[PDB]
Homo-oligomer: A and B are copies of this chain.
Amino acid sequence: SELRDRQAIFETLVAKGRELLACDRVIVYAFDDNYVGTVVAESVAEGWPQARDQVIEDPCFREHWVEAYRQGRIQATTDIFKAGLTECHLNQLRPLKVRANLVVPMVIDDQLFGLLIAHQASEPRQWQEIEIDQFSELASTGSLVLERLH
């Protein structure tokens, strides 16, 4: 089925993504038609909370970032507590122990299907250029495969 195919690619991306970065969590944050996100796949190291299957109603993608991510925006944050973020934003990340994160888009048929997101937990992390390139390329490869499968 189309749903089984997407999930297989998503499980591949989170597993390979966490291996590539040796970070604490990688997820696929998939959007519904109103850009409400569901954590549909997760690779997470031992001891950290599981984000899998959580629904996170974060309005900034629908309201502000859909176009930039469609166009290939990448967001990397070394220290979420030093990024000018509001408490509402921080309270989504605190339970998952996020301290640093890297966000790349999954664009399929020119549409923003979701985000591949890496977390460093309870520890800041400066994401390096070639790490970002490898992670962006992983998301693109996965997205291109899904484009070709159907």
Residues of A within 8 A of B (CB): 5, 8-9, 11-12, 15-16, 20, 130, 134, 137-138, 140-142, 144-145, 148-149
Contact = CB atoms under 8 A, between A and B. Distances in A.
With a 10 A CB-CB cut-off, give which of A130, A137, A141, A144 has the most chain B CB atoms: A141
B144 A141 contact: no
Query: Which has the most chain B C-beta neighbours within 10 Å: A134, A137, A145?
Result: A145
B16 A148 contact: no
Per assembly, the copies of the chain total 2
Q: Is the interface of A mostly helix, strand, loop or mixed?
A: helix
Nearest to A150: B8
Given A130-B130, A137-B134, A149-B5, A144 B20 contact: no
A20 B140 CA distance: 11
B144 A145 contact: no
A5 B4 CA distance: 13
Contact of A144 (B15, B148, B149): B15
Contact of A9 (B16, B134, B138, B145): B145
